[PDB]
Design an enzyme around this catalytic site. Structure first.
Site, mmCIF file in Angstrom:
data_model
loop_
_atom_site.group_PDB
_atom_site.id
_atom_site.type_symbol
_atom_site.label_atom_id
_atom_site.label_comp_id
_atom_site.label_asym_id
_atom_site.label_seq_id
_atom_site.Cartn_x
_atom_site.Cartn_y
_atom_site.Cartn_z
ATOM 1 N N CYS A 65 -1.820 1.399 -3.416
ATOM 2 C CA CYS A 65 -1.134 0.379 -2.849
ATOM 3 C C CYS A 65 -0.131 -0.140 -3.842
ATOM 4 C CB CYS A 65 -1.818 -0.428 -2.246
ATOM 5 S SG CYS A 65 -0.930 -2.093 -1.562
ATOM 6 N N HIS B 294 2.312 1.929 -2.441
ATOM 7 C CA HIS B 294 2.749 1.626 -1.365
ATOM 8 C C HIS B 294 4.423 1.727 -1.321
ATOM 9 C CE1 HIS B 294 3.854 -1.087 2.013
ATOM 10 N NE2 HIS B 294 2.476 -0.839 2.530
#
EC number: 3.1.2.-
Lengths: 186, 186
Positions: free
Chosen positions: B104, B124
């Protein structure tokens, strides 16, 4: 606006606890993680230790909730199934026609407390025989099943779909879709 | 047999912490959840509170580990990025050619600590611009990316695939497949 009670017992599957809590909070649901045995830290099935927001004793007096959520994990579900407080909460929820959501072995606590007999349900494959003892539910292999107020799902890998089904039921499809996008789901 | 260090900072994405910890423990990896700021409970991004197994101060002296895992969440990744202890751990891991796994916003701590420059990485979508500042990595939109010892992934919804990639790298494909089956993944 909407409120969720997540009942956290020793031996709960921590993925099945955290994914719904997090996703529901992303949806703006007010979530209370309530420790079955009190407000002390709870050792989950794979040894993750989670600090509850409240004891179940206290949280159950702050009802009622728009959803009551039962994580799975066999040992967590066995603790849920043995608890008088859980029984009372679930009976009250059923009687007020509020949502009850259970995943993996979690739905076996519905059987223990005589909740939602006659519903179509799923569980983890390894919890099917327990859930079906006495033939009080109709079994489904769908990843998420919803029959009226009884929402069930299968395992760690269905947890996002389960949580998003809760969000859809409470806050609608648009909110669920908005929450889903940044998750990078398959 | 194999050992994993998961570094847990305030503001970490709790799904991205718990899914890898749990899946790695299912694989028989010895996992230490180490609190960046000490052994005190850590408030994660969506308010789940996790009790670490150890402080990072203590855990880093019990090295070395077969994988070092950096969860995401923007605020957790910012704490990782600001920590001298994290820098030292990651530098040591890179120098001993051990696995580094980040999800992420987590990979942005690699940039902060100058780890693995020249690798192909994902993050992400919202962390891409931060990761790519200075052009020290090549960007991928694959759900999981692995370039030598640098293993990266995108979000909550890629966490199972990320964790299973760690298991495959450490314990092989057969163990990963065995662990995966009972998860009820898509």
């Amino acid at each position: 606006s909407k409120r969720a009670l997540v009942i956290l017992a020793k031996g709960a599957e921590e993925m099945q606890t955290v994914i719904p809590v997090d996703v529901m909070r992303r949806a703006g649901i007010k979530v209370t993680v309530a420790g079955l045995a009190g407000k002390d830290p709870v050792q989950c099935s794979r040894d993750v230790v989670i600090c509850p927001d409240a004891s179940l004793e206290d949280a159950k007096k702050e009802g009622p909730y728009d959803v009551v959520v039962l994580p799975g994990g066999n040992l967590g579900a066995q603790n849920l199934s043995e608890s008088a407080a859980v029984k009372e909460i679930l009976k009250e929820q059923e009687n007020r026609k509020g949502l009850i959501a259970a995943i993996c072995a979690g739905p076996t606590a519905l059987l223990a407390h005589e909740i939602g007999f006659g519903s179509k349900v799923t569980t983890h494959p390894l919890a099917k025989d327990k859930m079906m003892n006495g033939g009080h539910y109709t079994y489904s292999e769908n990843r998420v099943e919803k029959d009226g107020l009884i929402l069930t799902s299968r395992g760690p890998g269905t947890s996002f779909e389960f949580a998003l089904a809760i969000v859809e039921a409470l806050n609608g499809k648009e909110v669920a879709a908005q929450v889903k996008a940044p998750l990078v789901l398959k």
